[PDB]
Scaffold this active site. Structure first.
Site, PDB file in Angstrom:
ATOM      1  N   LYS A 165      43.814  32.812  47.228  1.00 23.88           N
ATOM      2  CA  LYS A 165      44.713  32.318  46.189  1.00 23.88           C
ATOM      3  C   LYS A 165      46.146  32.527  46.633  1.00 23.88           C
ATOM      4  O   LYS A 165      46.678  33.639  46.577  1.00 23.88           O
ATOM      5  CB  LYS A 165      44.447  32.974  44.833  1.00 23.88           C
ATOM      6  CG  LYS A 165      43.056  32.700  44.294  1.00 23.88           C
ATOM      7  CD  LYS A 165      43.050  32.562  42.773  1.00 23.88           C
ATOM      8  CE  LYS A 165      41.724  31.953  42.312  1.00 23.88           C
ATOM      9  NZ  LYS A 165      41.752  31.435  40.901  1.00 23.88           N
TER      10      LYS A 165
ATOM     11  N   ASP B 185      39.472  38.468  27.065  1.00 23.37           N
ATOM     12  CA  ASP B 185      39.545  37.115  27.590  1.00 23.37           C
ATOM     13  C   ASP B 185      38.221  36.641  28.194  1.00 23.37           C
ATOM     14  O   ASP B 185      38.226  35.824  29.130  1.00 23.37           O
ATOM     15  CB  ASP B 185      40.640  37.066  28.674  1.00 23.37           C
ATOM     16  CG  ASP B 185      41.975  36.604  28.132  1.00 23.37           C
ATOM     17  OD1 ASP B 185      41.988  35.529  27.500  1.00 23.37           O
ATOM     18  OD2 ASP B 185      43.007  37.294  28.335  1.00 23.37           O
TER      19      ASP B 185
END
Length: 238
Positions: free
Chosen positions: A28, A115
């Site tokens: 990433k 989340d």
């Protein structure tokens, strides 16, 4: 890890592999342009080492970019749910044990996730669940997460896990409605149907997870002691 193979998407995300171990990895690539949230991800991922939490093998930094080297898991648990038929109770329980083990570990290190959702629960090539984010990637949010008031403790992840279990077992969301106000009202009042095809153990567990008053909500440790939960529980998960 070492040498790049392909760009998976969009800085960008690339596929790579370690030329020693052969381990598949995602790069990433984050270009400097908020920053505390990336640091929170890196910090959490370094602190938590668990079979069902995505591994962070390295963070490569320069003045211009941050590169996270993260274990590759190429599928979402929810595309597995959607693309297959209504899954057997045994299959759902297998996934559920993995999720709860990982969440327990988070709570143990004083991290509440808040989340737990479709995009965040990845599946690797051996169909092992991997919690992948912590925040930086509605039907799954506890009532107190939705409203401002009421502190969001460990119990909000219990509620989210109860929705996840419901979805795996019933192939539908418990609180979903096409109408925005009705959906929010259903979640805040905890209005849902427990289908009659559910085993007594599965239904009993879900009922105790989806409770508005977080005080009466089952705890992670009580879940792990539940009779239905314990069936065929792999020793490594304790």
């Amino acid at each position: 890890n070492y040498q790049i193979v392909k760009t998976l998407g969009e800085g960008k995300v690339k596929l790579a592999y370690h030329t020693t171990t052969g381990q598949k990895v995602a790069l990433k690539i984050i270009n400097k342009k908020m920053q505390g949230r990336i640091e929170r991800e890196i910090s959490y991922l370094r602190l938590l080492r668990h079979p069902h939490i995505i591994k962070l093998y390295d963070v490569i930094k320069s003045k211009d970019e941050i590169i996270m080297v993260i274990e590759y898991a190429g599928n979402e648990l929810f595309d597995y749910i959607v693309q297959r038929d209504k899954m057997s109770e045994q299959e759902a329980r297998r996934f559920f044990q993995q999720i709860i083990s990982a969440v327990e570990y988070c709570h143990r290190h004083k991290i509440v996730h808040r989340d737990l959702k479709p995009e965040n629960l990845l599946l690797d090539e051996h169909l092992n669940v991997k919690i992948a984010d912590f925040g930086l990637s509605p039907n799954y949010a506890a009532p107190e997460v939705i409203s401002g008031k009421l502190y969001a403790g460990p119990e909000v992840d219990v509620w989210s896990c109860g929705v996840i279990l419901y979805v795996m077992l019933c192939r539908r969301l418990p609180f979903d409605d096409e109408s925005i106000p009705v959906l929010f009202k259903n979640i805040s009042n905890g209005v849902y149907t427990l289908p009659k095809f559910l085993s007594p153990g599965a239904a009993g567990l879900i009922k105790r997870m989806l409770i508005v008053n977080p005080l009466n909500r089952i705890s992670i440790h009580e879940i792990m002691q539940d009779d239905w939960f314990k069936v065929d529980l792999p020793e490594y998960l304790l």
